[PDB]
Amino acid sequence: LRVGLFPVRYLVGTGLPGAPQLVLDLMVDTVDHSVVGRAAVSQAVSPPLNFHADVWGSYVFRLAIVQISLQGNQGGPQSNSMITFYGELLLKGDGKTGVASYRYYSNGSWHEVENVPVKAD
């Protein structure tokens, strides 16, 4: 589905110094409505956050909001490794920007980031 296939990068975070930053190098099949890629999470604080997990999921356009629900781990969906990531992007009908929430797992603990801005590229 190369025609339906195409990549997209989502920067999820406020961008404030010391604030968490999510980068989403993902891919979108507009046929299967599937989503897959990598999730790098960093806050640039003490100690530096370096969360990386293969993330997969799907998107649902709704009348106009584009809702993407994503989940992630070490290896992707055929791996039995524990889920270390949940994210939901509620992009606007244009898809360029929008609000979003995500949870990454670190040090035996879940870290929740709610209502942070999203930009592509």
TrEMBL record:
Annotated coiled-coil segments of the chain: none
Domain of life: Bacteria
Domain DUF1842: 3-110
Listed name of the protein: DUF1842 domain-containing protein
Source organism per UniProt: Burkholderia pseudomallei (strain K96243)
Covered residues, full protein: 5 to 135 of 212
